[PDB]
């Protein structure tokens, strides 16, 4: 009867009890330990967008993706990342990862200029660079014919394909980069289907660029073909990602450190190693985790 343990009921609070068991885990380390052996993917001074597009300012296997909240390094060229939040949701659960030259810069684009598709808004070692995973396609000496490259998924895995749509500030810019004044874009997959046209307008100098680039993405199921029809403004893919999805994987946005420790349960506040069914540490959890509660103790 020696134990001073206390339980609570609907009617009266703080009642001393002999035999009683806890349910809540309040204790944790400030460390972001590797989940079940496998190390996480930390993107310091970079966000998912920058890493996935191939921003020059910025590993295959990981347990979870870490991002510094302070990290703003993503779209070097100004624009709008379409369904970016929806892309994070899809990239939450990711085991394997193969980056491959879907449409290699060498062969794939022969009736177009691939080498002049670089800007100062996207620098790397002082040089005018661009995103490594996608080519900015411009006219091959005053002649931009209708391009129509198509990829057929042979990887067996879900293939993530990213591409851009350049919106020139002046009408003259469209006529100097693609020449075709009434240019269109089309991306056809079994699940994805959208037509694009450039929104020619002078916008504020964001990263000292008057024009903008919208960044679009889709997944291609194995066996399915993704077609790319364009007469201008398309920023074609170079590298795509054949990925194998995991279950217990997510995205942590925390400034907490990461150490060589192992953990069964991981939260942005820190790792947890408990047999308890409930936890009051943090609502975001990765792996076999005790369901979050706001309670003091249970």
């Amino acid at each position, epitope marked *: 009867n020696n134990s001073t343990d206390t339980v609570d009921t609907v009617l009266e609070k703080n009642v001393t009890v002999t035999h009683s068991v806890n349910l809540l885990e309040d204790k944790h380390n400030g460390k972001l330990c590797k989940l079940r052996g496998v190390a996480p993917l930390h993107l310091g001074k970079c966000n998912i967008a920058g890493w996935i597009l191939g921003n020059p300012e910025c590993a295959s296997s990981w347990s979870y993706i870490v991002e510094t909240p302070s990290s703003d390094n993503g779209t070097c060229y100004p624009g709008d990342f379409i369904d970016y939040e929806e892309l994070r949701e899809q990239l939450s659960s990711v085991s394997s990862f193969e980056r491959f030259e879907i449409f290699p810069k060498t062969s794939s684009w022969p009736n177009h200029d691939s080498d*002049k598709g670089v*800007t*100062a808004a996207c620098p790397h070692a002082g040089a*005018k660079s661009f995103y490594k995973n996608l080519i900015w396609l411009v006219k091959k000496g*005053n002649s931009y014919p209708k391009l129509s490259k198509s990829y057929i998924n042979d990887k067996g895995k879900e293939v993530l394909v990213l591409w851009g749509i350049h919106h*020139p*500030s*002046t*009408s*003259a*810019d469209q*006529q*100097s*980069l693609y*020449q075709n004044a009434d240019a269109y874009v089309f991306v056809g997959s079994s699940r994805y289907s959208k037509t694009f046209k450039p929104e020619i307008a*002078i916008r504020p100098k964001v990263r000292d*660029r*008057e*024009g903008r680039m919208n960044y679009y993405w889709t997944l291609v199921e194995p066996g399915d073909k993704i077609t790319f029809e364009a007469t201008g403004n398309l920023v074609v893919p170079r590298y795509a990602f054949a990925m194998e999805r995991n279950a217990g994987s997510g995205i942590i946005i925390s400034d907490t450190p990461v150490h060589d420790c192992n953990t069964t349960c991981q939260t942005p506040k820190g790792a947890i190693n408990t047999s308890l069914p409930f936890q009051n540490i943090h609502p975001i959890t990765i792996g076999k985790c005790p369901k979050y509660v706001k309670s003091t103790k249970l």
Partner: antibody, heavy 125, light 109 residues
Framework: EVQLVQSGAEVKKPGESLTISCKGS????????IGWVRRMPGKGLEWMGI????????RYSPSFQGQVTISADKSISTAYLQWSSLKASDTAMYYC??????????????????WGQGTTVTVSS | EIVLTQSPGTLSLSPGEGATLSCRAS???????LAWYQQKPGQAPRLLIF???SRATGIPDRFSGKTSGTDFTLTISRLEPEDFAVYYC?????????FGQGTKVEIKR
């Protein structure tokens, strides 16, 4: 407003040193390239050169390279057309102009929009 | 020098007629490098068409730019009394930038 205010009329005897201004007003002077166009009495328009005021780099025409010197002061937002030694052939009408180019930084030049009033230079003994 | 030779020498038109001005280059130049200017007597030049076909900042619908091969055209639908001036073409491709000969548009009488 978006206007270029050039230097006043100048009359000097040959051999002398003359420098004519061109003041960019109501815009980011350093963003746009500034050129220079000569017009001789009873002749056509001759292009002299261009300066990017932020880069302070000059690209002279073969007919004007070495002879005349194109200066630029981004701080005062003023372009210059400095003369080493004046020739009787330098008796002309001189214009400066804001050059139109691509917003992607590629080097495509579309012509020149904002023009100066015109500096009247007389070079006679 | 990429010699620009304007045709005709002078255009004699009645205020209301349609003007068509040619500018044939020595060698082939980029369309986006070509521009059309209007100079009035005792006045600084004005930009009408820049980048070959793009209409300048505050220019009426009547003024239009065309290019195919080496021809290069400045077309006006209605010639207003204000339109009667000297018209120049200019290339901005191979340095030095050269200006055309210049066609004067005079009131036909």
């Amino acid at each position: 407003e978006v206007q270029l205010v050039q230097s006043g009329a100048e009359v000097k005897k040959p051999g002398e040193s003359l420098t004519i201004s061109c003041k960019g007003s109501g815009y980011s002077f350093s963003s746009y390239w500034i050129g220079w166009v000569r017009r001789m009495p009873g002749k056509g328009l001759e292009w002299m050169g261009i300066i990017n005021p932020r880069d302070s780099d000059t690209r002279y025409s073969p007919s004007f390279q070495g002879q005349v010197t194109i200066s630029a002061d981004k701080s005062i937002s003023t372009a210059y057309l400095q003369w080493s030694s004046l020739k009787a052939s330098d008796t002309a009408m001189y214009y400066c102009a804001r050059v139109v180019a691509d917003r992607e930084g590629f080097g495509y030049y579309y012509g020149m929009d904002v023009w100066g009033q015109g500096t009247t230079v007389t070079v006679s003994s | 020098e990429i010699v620009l030779t304007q045709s005709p020498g002078t255009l004699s038109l009645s205020p209301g007629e349609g003007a068509t001005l040619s500018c044939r280059a020595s060698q082939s130049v980029d369309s986006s490098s070509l521009a059309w200017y209007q100079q009035k007597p005792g006045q600084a030049p004005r930009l009408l068409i820049f980048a070959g076909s793009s209409r300048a900042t505050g220019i009426p619908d009547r003024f239009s730019g065309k290019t195919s091969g080496t021809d290069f055209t400045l077309t006006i639908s209605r010639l207003e009394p204000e339109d009667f001036a000297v018209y120049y073409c200019q290339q901005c491709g191979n340095s030095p930038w050269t200006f055309g000969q210049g066609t004067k548009v005079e009131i036909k009488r």
